[PDB]
Each structure stands twice: as C-alpha cells, then as structure tokens.
Design a protein around this ligand. Structure first.
Ligand SMILES: [Mg+2]
Ligand SMILES: [Mg+2]
Ligand SMILES: [Mg+2]
Ligand SMILES: [Mg+2]
Ligand SMILES: [Mg+2]
Ligand SMILES: [Mg+2]
Ligand SMILES: [Mg+2]
Ligand SMILES: [Mg+2]
Ligand SMILES: [Mg+2]
Ligand SMILES: [Mg+2]
Ligand SMILES: [Mg+2]
Ligand SMILES: [Mg+2]
Ligand SMILES: [Mg+2]
Ligand SMILES: [Mg+2]
Ligand SMILES: [Mg+2]
Ligand SMILES: [Mg+2]
Ligand SMILES: [Mg+2]
Ligand SMILES: [Mg+2]
Ligand SMILES: [Mg+2]
Ligand SMILES: [Mg+2]
Ligand SMILES: [Mg+2]
Ligand SMILES: [Mg+2]
Ligand SMILES: [Mg+2]
Ligand SMILES: [Mg+2]
Ligand SMILES: [Mg+2]
Ligand SMILES: [Mg+2]
Ligand SMILES: [Mg+2]
Ligand SMILES: [Mg+2]
Ligand SMILES: [Mg+2]
Ligand SMILES: [Mg+2]
Ligand SMILES: [Mg+2]
Ligand SMILES: [Mg+2]
Ligand SMILES: [Mg+2]
Ligand SMILES: [Mg+2]
Lengths: 57, 217, 157, 46, 49, 112, 146
RNA sequence: AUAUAUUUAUUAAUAUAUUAUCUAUAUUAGUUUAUAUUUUAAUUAUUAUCAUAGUAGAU
RNA sequence: UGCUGACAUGAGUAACGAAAAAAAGGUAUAAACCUUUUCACCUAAAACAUAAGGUUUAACUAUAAAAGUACGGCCCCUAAUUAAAUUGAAUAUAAAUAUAUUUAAGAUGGGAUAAUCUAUAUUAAUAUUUAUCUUAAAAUAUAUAAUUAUAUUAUAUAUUAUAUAUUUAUAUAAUAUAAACUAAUAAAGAUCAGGAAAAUUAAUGUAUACCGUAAUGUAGACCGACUCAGGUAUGUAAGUAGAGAAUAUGAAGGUGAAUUAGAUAAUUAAAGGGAAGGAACUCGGCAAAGAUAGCUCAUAAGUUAGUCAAUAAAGAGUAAUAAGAACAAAGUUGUACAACUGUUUACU
C-alpha cells in the first residue's frame, strides 16, 4: 500500500496527477541524449581548443 | 610498463624513508554529497582505497564514487616519525571496520536518530560520519602516542606533532575534547590550513607547500 | 620553472596581498548591470565558510566573483554552480502543462565565516507567520472539495 | 508476438524528423507549419 | 507555497489567457472566489478591472 | 449466460431482502462487563478494560529512549547551523496527519 | 558436475618455511581500540566578524523586516526624470548600485516569504518595483543626455 | 575485554553476566585461495533452514 | 442495431493481477506506514554501478558541487547520409524539381600530457576474425657429462648489497604460492583479403567557460489502455563445488506485494504416490513414465571415406552391491518428400 490512507483503488496514480499531456514543450538542459547541449547564454568567452578544451579570451 | 604506482600498495615505513616523498603525515578527506570520510596515506587517493574502506555498504552508508569534484581535504595530521604515521593509518582503518562491521550495533546507538528511526539526513548527507572521523582520529592519535613516548631526548628534540584543519569549526571544543594531558605532553598544536587561493581547485599545491613547511629540515 | 597551477596560486596570493583583485579583470565593462542575486540559507551539507546564491540563469561563474568583489567587497575563492530542473506543473487538469522555471544556484567559499540571523518568533513579525496562509489554503481546499452533505460538516480551518 | 509497443521514444529521432527545423527547412515542412499556424494551433511543431 | 515562479515568467500564453478571461463569463469565476473565501474578508461589491 | 430480460423491482428486492439468511440478525448476546461496568459481547473481553491494562503494562515496562550524550550538549545555535530545518513533501505531510485516516475505538455504552 | 565419482582436488602448493619472504610489515593496529561517541563541531570556535560583507544582504542584521521596520509607502516616492537630469554620471552610477543593493535585499525577503510563508503581502515586491522604476528612469536620462 | 560482589595488593585472582573467535602486510598488474607474519581469534555436543515433502525406507 | 446526457438490470455477483510471514513499540488510533527481533525469497539477481525514456516520481524548495590527470558532453576530424547552400549560360525538366562538382552539417567511431602529477593557446622558421602449438634450453624426481618423466616459456615490484651525476634516478647480482583474468610488442593459419579524416622546432602565454551529475533504470518511477506475469542496451555479479556464467546453498544487499481472516464440500488448475495388469486408451503412445556415469576405454552394418553413421546401440574401469539433492543426459527400424545448415504465413 503506497499510500496508507487509500486502502482501495480510486484511480490515483503512483505519482503525479496525469500520465498524459502535451509533449511539444521546448527542450531544456536536463533532458535529452548525452550528446545534447542546450546552453544558458552564460559563456561567450574564449575558443574551444582542437583537443577539446577551452581558452578564456 | 610501470602499472603499479606509489598509491597502489600500502606503503610501510621502510618505503617512506627510502623514497621520502612526503613528511610523516596522514591526509583525511571528506565527501561533500554523502558526508563520508576517507583516510589516505598520500595527498592523492584512488579506487583501491575506497574499496578497502567501504566494505559493508548499505542504503545509509552508500559506497562513494571517485569523482574528485566532491572530495575535499578535511584534516592533515603530521607525526614525528613514519612509524607513527603508519600506525595511525592502521588504527583509523580498524575503527572504520569496527564501526561498519564488527561493532555496528554499538556504534548505531551513539549516532543521532531522527523520527522514523533513521540516521539523520538532509538529502544523502549525514553529518554523523564527519563527526565520527574526528572522534576516531582523536582516539587513534591517543592510542598511537601511548605506545611510544620517550619522555626524554634520545638523539634530537622531535618535531612537535601538529594538525591542520580546513576551519576551526570542524573540530569540537578545545576543552572537553582535544585537551587530554597526553597531547599537551607532545605539544599537539591545532593549526589552520592556508586559506588564500581556491582551496578545492588548488588543493594539490597547498598540500605540497604545507608538506615542505612540515619538513622543516 | 614552476607549474601552471603554482603560478595561479601565486597570482591569487599576490592579489590578496596587494589589496587588488585575486582574479583577472575582463575587458567587457558593464557599467549599469541589472542582475540581482538572492542569498540562501545554509544547508546541512554546507559549512559556516560558504554561501549559496540564486544567480541569474545567464551568469558565468566568473561573473559572480566580479559581482561580489566590486559591489559588496566580498571575495569568493571557489565558486561552483548547481543548475536545477523544472518539474511539470498545472494549476488545473484542463490547462496546458509547462515546466517550472529553471533556477541557477552557485555556492561560494569565503574567508570569513558567516552565521545567519535568528528567525523571528511568531509574535513579532507579521509577515513571518505561516499559520494564516496555510490555514487559508486548508479552508480553500475544504470548500472546493465539499460536494454534497459534507457542506454542514464542521471545518478544521 | 505481443504488439502495442510501436512507439519507442528517442529525443534525437523525435526532434530530427518531427522538429521545427525538421519542417522549417523544407518546402513541404513549411507548408504544414503555416497550415497549423493558420488554424490557430498553439503547438506548431515538436 | 514554494514554486520559484516569482523569479521567472514561464507560461506567458497560459497566464495571459487565465488573467484575461472573457468578460461575459466573469460570473463563472466570481462564484468560485466567493464560495472559497471566509466571510470576514469578502465584500458584496463587484470588482473592477 | 446473460440475463434475457431486465430484472424488475419486485424480483430484485425479494431476492436480496426476502430470505432470512441474507438479512443481518439482532445481536442478543450482550452482557455487562464485571470490571468496566459497560456493555460487552458475551464470552468475550471488555476492550476498554483490556486496553487500559495494556496501557499500564506499556508505561511500566517501557524501554528508556536512547538520547546520545553528544546531542544534549549542543546549544540552540549549533543545532541550527548543523541540523537545519527541511521541507516535507505532499506524501510526507499527509502521512503525519494520521487523524484523517486512523481513528480510535469507540467507548461502549453503559448497561444498567 | 559434482558426481559421486569425483575425487577431491589436490591441495595447493605451500612455500617451505626456509624460503618464505618475511613480510615488510610486522606490527599492526592496536587491539585495545574502543569506539567513542561522535564529537559535533561547535561554533564557539568561530570568530564570524561583525563587519562581514554578507551583512549587506540584510537590513540592520535582521532576518526579515516586519511591517513597522519597512519604509511606509506614504513617506516615499521614486525619483523623477527631471530630478535625475541634475545629476552627474558618477552620482547616477552611485545611485544605480545603491538601488541594486537594496533590490538584492528585498529579493531575498520576497523569496523567503513566498517560498516558506506563502503570504501575498508583496510589500517587498512593490518596493522593488518602485526601485525598478527609478533604475530605468536613470537609464532614460543617460541616453537622452548622450 | 567490560561490569558487579569476594580474596589479595588501582594491579592480579575467584564467582556471576555480557560481548567476540575478527582484523592487517607479504608471495611482480586485478580477484579467489593457500602459507608465513600481528592479535585471543577454540573445539565438541545438539538443533535449524534450502535443494519437488531435496531424496530412499518405514508409518 | 438513431445522436447526446442522466439512471437502472447483470450485482453487491466475477474480480482485487506469479508471492511468507509473526510478535512488541510508535499508537488504551493500524493486517496495509515507521522501528527492533524471528522466519522466508531473490542472490552470473528481485544486489551494486550505468545508458535511453519519463507527469522530479528522489533521502525535496535550505534540493542533485568538475581545468584535467578512466569524466562524459562541449571542441578538432570524418562514415552511412542530408542540404530553398555554391557552379549571356554546370546539365535536365510544364511548375514543383532532379542530376554532377564543391562547401556545410552529421556518432553509433578516432583525438598527445599526466601522482615523481600535466598544460591544449599566439607568433616565426623548416589495427577483420583467430591460437600461443612442436623442438630447444635452463630447473626438478628416479636412475648413470649420456637417458626417462615433469611446472615454466615474454613484461607487470618489493627487499637486500654494490657502481655511476650526487639521501634523488639508472644499472648490476640474489630472494619471493597456485588457479582464473586484464593491456602491449613480440611470433603466425585461413580466405570471407579486413573504415574515413584532422608535422617539428624557437620564443611568449595559462587567473582554468557552458551543460550533464538526484532517484527509477530486468521496472510501482520507461513502451505496452492498468502501480499490466509482455518488450527494454552494458560491467561486476562473496564464498563452497564443479569443465562450466550449468546445477545446490547463500556472505553482503535488497525484498516479502491496494486485499485480509476461517473449512478447504462438489468441481477446476499445478504437483506427489499408487496394488494386479501394461496401450487393452486413443483418429493416432496426445499426455505422462522411462536415464546404471557427467570422466577414461570400446564402438557394427551401410557409405559420397567424412569417428558421416556416432554422444552408434549393447559393454567395460573408478567406492555402488537396498535407497536417499539439483542440473546435463530419453532406444531401434522400414517407407514417402527434400540433398544437407537455413527462410516463411507478427497473432490458427
Ligand atoms: Mg535523460
Ligand atoms: Mg581538482
Ligand atoms: Mg557543472
Ligand atoms: Mg498506441
Ligand atoms: Mg528516419
Ligand atoms: Mg533459496
Ligand atoms: Mg429511439
Ligand atoms: Mg450470478
Ligand atoms: Mg458466486
Ligand atoms: Mg471471489
Ligand atoms: Mg500495534
Ligand atoms: Mg544460474
Ligand atoms: Mg557463485
Ligand atoms: Mg540501481
Ligand atoms: Mg564538420
Ligand atoms: Mg561518441
Ligand atoms: Mg543518474
Ligand atoms: Mg548515482
Ligand atoms: Mg511489469
Ligand atoms: Mg507510460
Ligand atoms: Mg542472508
Ligand atoms: Mg530495488
Ligand atoms: Mg498482488
Ligand atoms: Mg499403478
Ligand atoms: Mg507394481
Ligand atoms: Mg486400440
Ligand atoms: Mg476401443
Ligand atoms: Mg510425447
Ligand atoms: Mg565399417
Ligand atoms: Mg534433459
Ligand atoms: Mg520404393
Ligand atoms: Mg529440407
Ligand atoms: Mg532445419
Ligand atoms: Mg503462424
């Protein structure tokens, strides 16, 4: 019994309110494949190096 | 190929004197996510030490990850001899084993329990582990010194053992703890780690610079 | 002669000794910034020598160091960023779902420890009194869920 | 074998073949983008 | 009531729609607010935009 | 294996409320508690009298709470800086409100 | 598989006592080592200064300003565009950052109120908005001047 | 080893109770085992669980 | 078999979805939540780390901490491939557009430094898959520099004692268990003949950007209408025993479930045993039962010469002579069709 105050089935979900809804919301940083990179307009300084680093300008 | 490094094995006193990589001292690290503590014989630590220290991991004392971004050095203890340093390291590890496996029942009742009977946590951080490390270090140090105490000048006045915390807050009160006569006999001094540069970012340079100062000769 | 990391340490030590920036000042000068940062109460995993802030999302780690030093005089040695997620939320099941705002938080290690002030007792600060808002919400939910004969049932609000 | 699990999610494919740029960068894609806009749809694309 | 909403403006379209309800259907919401408030902060006068 | 016609009000009622077995029976086996003095079921024990004795056992054979020496020596300030307050979730908050889904037994009526 | 016909495997070889290398360690931990109660860290060891810069994030070293302490709305009024025109760049610069500093303080109080108490008093929000008005009025004056 | 009574002189011993039969280094990188090294890290007796009711013979 | 809304009958009936639980206390509020003890299940997983996915569901608003040295993305480079892009007049075509060349994008791939911790920038000059076989020699046991048999064929770092620039490094010599297993050159068998792309010095320089980080991830946290016995990628996966990741237990960990408590009628499903017969059953030995080694020997006819037949059937050696875990292991022959290994009607 996940919720001791709900002994019988009342339609309540395991978590949240609805299992369905819109999926066309804009992407964010925390979600996507490991190769995704959203960014936060917080770095326009320097130049990526050829090896894969950074150089602050 | 030299697969084995200075930190792969457990280095005894004879190895330290021949190599003289660092002055006799033991580093104590803390984890900033789970709140756990790791004892190291060198400024650097790897997966082998973690495995040898967390042998009985459960949902409370989870095995930490070797992600350097969440490990920070808490206290660097310097000792007069290499035998003392090795002996302290062994004592600290024994308590961790006793506290985790052999005498877990008696350790548990000393810990702080919140409602629901679990060990206090704010997330996965449990301060009881850091406090335990400080207490164990104090007890191990006391048992380290009591075995050997010349009480005289054998060949040369030995260097006074010292201790290097990040901040004075971490250690308890200077009166009800860390005030036994034995420590005052050897003149244990509570000193603070140099705090100017980026500590975590530049810990390696700090530890060496403190290592050179410790080796006054 | 010396490693890069040693040189970085020397520069920071030199800056503190001379009463000047312990970092490198960039060339893009902002004369009238509008960024605001919120101090946050310490967590258990913190120490009295740190402080956590809710910085703007478009805020570099270097930006906060300059922001603190030049406006407040506080020098942050190590700064580290924790960017949070936004959970889906909806005021009612009939409306479209959208994510909660992402909040960027950074933690700074300082040289002089800080301890927050004591929180007011519920008898002096009118604002800091959680009974009234929670009580209203309990009344709000109770009267929205009372469907039939429960109208006459006494309320706990 | 059992069916019903035809939709196996993947953000890369879902965005690459149904995303906004996946349609804004083609004649046919743009046409359906503007058709949805004219109908007044809130969510033009993925 | 921790929501972090005051620090940002997310859902501009939905917020505008909710806050710009049609004037014909205000009585729908007026009943909701009235029935869901204590009597000692409610007045019997209509509100003003 | 399916009803061929809708069952009328008459047939439904006499099927459920007709027979004596389907209808519940008067409780005639009630006695007076020798100790409580109130009503109780025959050949059973008075729950209140049993409950209070169990209470006596609990308070006289309770194990002292483990209160570690370390904690009681901390000032309020150190407790705050070391054990800050934390917020609870909806599930956790509801669970603490145990008076909404747990309720105690009702004291039986007195028999004269 | 372990059938009934299986025979025990031969014992492993053992190095003779005359050739076994002595271990590099002979002494070990102490067997009289007892578990002590944890020792909490204490703030009595600290010296948190009274001039600490973070104090600028609080109003007179107070957790959250009450109604009386907050400046009343009647007694106050944001700057006016003509008034800012009589100010030097340095003074306008000084005003901007003073506005920003209190904006940080008010933001800290709003967040604490709206994230813990949940009250909708928004007295701090209105004060911040009034400061925000002055801030853009400063920006307008500078542009018009340039 | 700790605690309580007795003897002896806070050490040692008897009685009782509780607890434990661990751990750590070396044998060329990792794991397991074996031996040596450090510590106090025991042998018996009678039970118990799992393997289709583990399985066979009885009942 | 009209559309929509409300309410009936079936009916308080079927069902509550692989399952081990019990007492005491939180709490004179508990089968369902928390703690302690007992019992049990999973344990080459129902454990521990991860990838993708997702209404953040997490130990939660005071919340998931990175210069790099096993930390990934980001960045350099490209494969398959893509492109309202580039080329009096590139070519073609009712429009849409297609074709060829360039350029750009595109990981599922490649990218020096590093615990004696390391330094990526600016300027100037010039590798498919696959095995470690045989001889040799050292060393060892019985025998007499000859012979039989035997572990080893190459590296992985500690100690002792010596020589070099001078207690830092190298070199030398001697000592140091077995079974698995790891990355690197070595050596070499077959044809099915085994990716693309992006320099060194000399000087100067480094104040270390942004994003990922919670928990679930063989599932109550993803795809399956469901807190659905279905589908879902990777590495460890204690010991004892074994050829083995089979099978048996289970150290540690996790776990014992939105259904409970009694008798277990007729009957149903999944299992155990069964006298005397032993296929009489049945369309039809369907189902069920049947294993006298699992190691070492031995092993016929036919035959395309291939221990194909063949793991040949029966048989032998090893304690078993009444039996006592689990797993592997289930006969012979004739005929029709097809050479054989394979593919096919997702769901008869
Ligand atoms: Mg993801
Ligand atoms: Mg670092
Ligand atoms: Mg980060
Ligand atoms: Mg579907
Ligand atoms: Mg496709
Ligand atoms: Mg089992
Ligand atoms: Mg009709
Ligand atoms: Mg019926
Ligand atoms: Mg029935
Ligand atoms: Mg039923
Ligand atoms: Mg109870
Ligand atoms: Mg198996
Ligand atoms: Mg095993
Ligand atoms: Mg897991
Ligand atoms: Mg490219
Ligand atoms: Mg890749
Ligand atoms: Mg994760
Ligand atoms: Mg994790
Ligand atoms: Mg499932
Ligand atoms: Mg789903
Ligand atoms: Mg177990
Ligand atoms: Mg689990
Ligand atoms: Mg169930
Ligand atoms: Mg029979
Ligand atoms: Mg028979
Ligand atoms: Mg027949
Ligand atoms: Mg017949
Ligand atoms: Mg059959
Ligand atoms: Mg033949
Ligand atoms: Mg079989
Ligand atoms: Mg024929
Ligand atoms: Mg065929
Ligand atoms: Mg076939
Ligand atoms: Mg078929």
């Amino acid at each position: 019994l996940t919720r001791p105050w709900k002994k019988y089935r009342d339609g309540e979900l395991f978590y949240g309110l609805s299992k369905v809804g819109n999926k066309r919301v804009p992407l964010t940083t925390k979600q996507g494949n490991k190769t995704m990179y959203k960014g936060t307009r917080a770095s326009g300084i320097g130049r990526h190096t050829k090896f894969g680093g950074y150089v602050i300008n | 190929m030299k697969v084995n490094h200075s930190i792969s094995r457990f280095r005894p006193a004879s190895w330290f004197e021949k190599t003289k990589i660092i002055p006799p001292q033991v580093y104590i690290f803390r984890n900033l996510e789970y709140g756990q503590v790791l004892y190291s014989q060198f400024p650097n630590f790897s997966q082998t030490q973690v495995d040898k220290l967390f042998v009985r991991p459960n949902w409370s004392n989870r095995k930490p990850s070797l992600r350097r971004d969440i490990w920070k050095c808490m206290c660097v203890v310097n000792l007069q001899n290499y035998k003392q340093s090795v002996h302290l390291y062994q004592n600290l590890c024994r308590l961790r084993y006793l506290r985790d496996v052999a005498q877990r029942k008696e350790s548990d009742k000393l810990r702080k329990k919140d409602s629901n009977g679990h060990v206090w946590y704010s997330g996965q951080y449990r301060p009881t582990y850091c406090q335990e490390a400080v207490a164990d270090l104090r007890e191990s140090l006391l048992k380290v010194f009591e075995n050997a105490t010349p009480a005289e000048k054998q060949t040369v006045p030995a260097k006074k053992p010292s201790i290097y915390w990040e901040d004075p807050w971490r250690m308890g009160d200077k009166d009800k703890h860390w005030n036994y006569d034995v420590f005052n006999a050897l003149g244990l001094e509570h000193k603070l780690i140099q705090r100017v540069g980026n500590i975590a970012r530049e810990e390696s340079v700090i530890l060496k610079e403190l290592a050179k100062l410790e080796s006054h000769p | 002669d010396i490693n890069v990391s040693e040189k970085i340490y020397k520069w920071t030590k030199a800056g503190i000794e001379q009463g000047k920036e312990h970092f490198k000042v960039g060339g893009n000068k902002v004369y009238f910034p509008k960024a605001r940062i919120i101090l946050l109460r310490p967590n258990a995993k913190h120490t009295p020598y740190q402080a956590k802030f809710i910085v703007p999302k478009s805020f570099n780690k270097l930006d906060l160091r300059d922001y603190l030093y030049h406006i407040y005089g506080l020098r942050a040695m190590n700064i580290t960023t924790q960017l949070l997620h936004g959970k889906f939320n909806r005021m009612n099941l009939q409306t479209t779902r959208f994510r909660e705002p992402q909040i960027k938080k950074m933690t700074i290690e300082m040289e002089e420890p800080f301890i927050w002030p004591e929180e007011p007792r519920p008898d002096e600060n009118s604002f800091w009194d959680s009974t009234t808002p929670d009580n209203m919400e309990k009344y709000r939910e109770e009267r929205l869920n009372c469907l039939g004969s429960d109208a006459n049932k006494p309320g706990t609000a | 074998k059992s069916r019903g699990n035809t939709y196996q999610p993947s953000t890369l494919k879902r965005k690459r073949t149904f995303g906004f740029l996946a349609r804004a960068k083609s004649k046919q894609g743009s046409k359906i983008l503007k058709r949805r806009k004219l109908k007044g749809r809130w969510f033009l694309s993925h | 009531s921790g929501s972090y909403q005051h620090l940002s403006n997310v859902g501009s379209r939905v917020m505008k729609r909710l806050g710009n309800r049609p004037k014909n259907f205000l009585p729908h919401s007026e009943k909701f607010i009235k029935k869901s408030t204590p009597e000692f902060m409610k007045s019997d006068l209509k509100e003003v935009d | 294996a399916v009803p061929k016609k809708k069952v009328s009000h008459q047939k439904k009622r006499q099927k459920l409320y007709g027979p004596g077995k389907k209808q519940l029976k008067m409780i005639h086996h009630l006695n007076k508690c020798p100790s409580c003095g109130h009503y109780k079921r025959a050949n059973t024990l008075c729950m209140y009298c049993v409950g209070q004795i169990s209470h006596i056992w609990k308070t006289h054979t309770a194990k002292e709470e483990i209160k570690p020496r370390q904690e009681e020596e901390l000032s309020e300030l150190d407790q705050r800086v070391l054990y800050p307050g934390r917020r609870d979730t909806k599930y956790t908050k509801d669970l603490k409100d145990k008076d909404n889904y747990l309720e105690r037994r009702v004291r039986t009526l007195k028999k004269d | 598989a372990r059938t009934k016909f299986t025979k025990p495997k031969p014992k492993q070889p053992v190095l003779p006592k005359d050739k076994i290398r002595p271990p590099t360690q002979l002494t070990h931990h102490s067997n009289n080592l007892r578990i002590t109660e944890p020792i909490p860290p204490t703030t009595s060891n600290l010296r948190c200064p009274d001039d600490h810069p973070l104090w600028q994030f609080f109003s007179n070293k107070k957790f959250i300003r009450s109604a009386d302490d907050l400046p009343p709305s009647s007694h106050i009024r944001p700057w006016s565009i003509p008034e800012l025109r009589h100010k030097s760049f340095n003074d306008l610069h000084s005003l901007w950052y003073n506005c920003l500093r209190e904006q940080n303080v008010l933001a800290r109080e709003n967040h604490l109120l709206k994230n813990i108490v949940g009250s909708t008093h928004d007295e701090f929000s209105e004060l911040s908005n009034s400061i925000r008005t002055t801030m853009w009025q400063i920006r307008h004056v500078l542009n018009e001047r340039e």
